[PDB]
């Protein structure tokens, strides 16, 4: 029942990083109106219409005090991760 967080207000607290457990982890900070559900997706380079982000954290939120951690699995190759308008490249082995 939360609204989707304003896509213009995210920044990297931790850019996408190898977790050690065959997943990608990251943390965003959010400067807008809370609480809200984080819009997160990923694409493989050249394929902008097909989301490839498989979330281990399926319902990531920014609570009034807390939230921002995201864990996902990505398919091999060049990918782009988007949290709102915020992006980062990820090359997956």
């Amino acid at each position, epitope marked *: 029942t939360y*609204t989707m967080c304003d896509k213009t*207000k995210f920044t990297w607290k931790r850019i996408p990083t190898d977790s050690g457990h065959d997943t990608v982890v990251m943390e965003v900070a959010f400067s807008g109106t*809370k609480p809200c559900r984080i819009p997160v997706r990923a694409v493989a380079h050249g394929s902008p219409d097909v989301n490839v982000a498989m979330l281990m954290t399926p319902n990531p939120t920014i609570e009034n005090n807390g939230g921002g951690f995201i864990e996902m699995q990505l398919p091999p190759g060049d990918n782009i991760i988007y949290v709102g308008e915020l992006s980062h490249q990820w090359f997956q082995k």
Partner: antibody
Amino acid sequence: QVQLVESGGGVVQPGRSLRLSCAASGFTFSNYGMHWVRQAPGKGLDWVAVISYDAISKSYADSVEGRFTISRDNSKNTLYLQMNSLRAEDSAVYYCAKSPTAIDPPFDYWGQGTLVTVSS
Amino acid sequence: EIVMTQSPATLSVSPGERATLSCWASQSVSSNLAWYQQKPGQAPRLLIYGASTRATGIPARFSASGSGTEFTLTISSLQSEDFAVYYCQQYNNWPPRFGQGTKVEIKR
């Protein structure tokens, strides 16, 4: 220049329905969140509802939840407020307000308002 | 529930003089705080967002500061068109909430 023009206000009887609309021009409507705010005569500003740029997210003040529905038509650049089960205390000038971003306040541009009077 | 309280209710200031308006929040709203100006019979106009950033087209004599639970709007040289009702609005938390307003009138 950004322009917001409300219509649909008038007299409506208690218990009945009224649809307000807001025609937007001068900006890419579908990029911005949109809000409704109201102001009873002689009183303060009163947030009513929000709809995100893509109409996926909606939120309502407690005072109107379950009675009002916000929606938008991004091809016609139009914002709507469907107001059901109107009560006397819903009487107010109704403003549409634009967000500078995707859904959040503040309200960077405002329409002129449309007067809604709930009365018999 | 976040309660926004403005102070004072009404402010009389001689023209060309300074006016200082306060906004209190019942808990922290960080810097997600806006100020609006509404003149009689007109729609409101955004003056300040992000607690301290002047909106487009707002003259430099409007300034604002604060964060957390305490915020201030200042008009350093009050001109004839600056006389209106001023509202604060927190938008750190859903639902966003307006203060009840401060009326700034001319002293004569």
